Amino acid sequence: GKISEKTCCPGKFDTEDKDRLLQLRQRSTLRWTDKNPCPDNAETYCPFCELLGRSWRFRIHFGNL
RNA sequence: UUGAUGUCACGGAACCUUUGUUGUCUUCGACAUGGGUA
Ligand SMILES: [Zn+2]
């Protein structure tokens, strides 16, 4: 879970409005800590939650190839 | 030409069955051609 001096929480992969999602994850998620995910109203998010884009508005946007 | 907090599709052998095989003496004789003369 270390990345530089920071440590990543488990991320969040849990959506209440399931029917929005065309696909749902069937595989298990890899684990590295017992700690809970970052709060949904936090200001500061760990690097994994930045990569997830959880921090019309994107933080990391992938274009098509 | 995607939409985003969730994609094991490297998650799936074009695989399985089917005889290029059955039948046949390297033999042997009468035939071609269209008129001619009253
Ligand atoms: Zn986090």
Task: For this entry, give a set of tags.
part of a larger assembly, 8% helix, 65 residues, 1 helix, 6% strand, two-stranded antiparallel ribbon, 1 chains, binds zinc ion, RNA-binding, little secondary structure
Short description:
The chain has one helix spanning 47-51, and strands at residues 2-3, 6-7. It is largely without helices or strands and 65 residues long. The longest helix is centred in the C-terminal third of the chain and has 5 residues, at 47-51.
Question: Your description of this structure?
Answer:
Helices cover 8% and strands 6% of the residues. A two-stranded antiparallel ribbon has the order 1-2. The relative contact order is 0.26. The protein is built from 1 helix and 2 strands, in the order ββα. A hairpin with a 2-residue loop joins strand 1 (2-3) and strand 2 (6-7). The chain has 65 residues and is mostly loops. Residues 9, 37-38, 45-46, 48-49 line the site of zinc ion. The protein binds one RNA strand of 38 nucleotides through residues 11-15, 21-29, 37, 40, 49, 52-54, 58, 60-64.
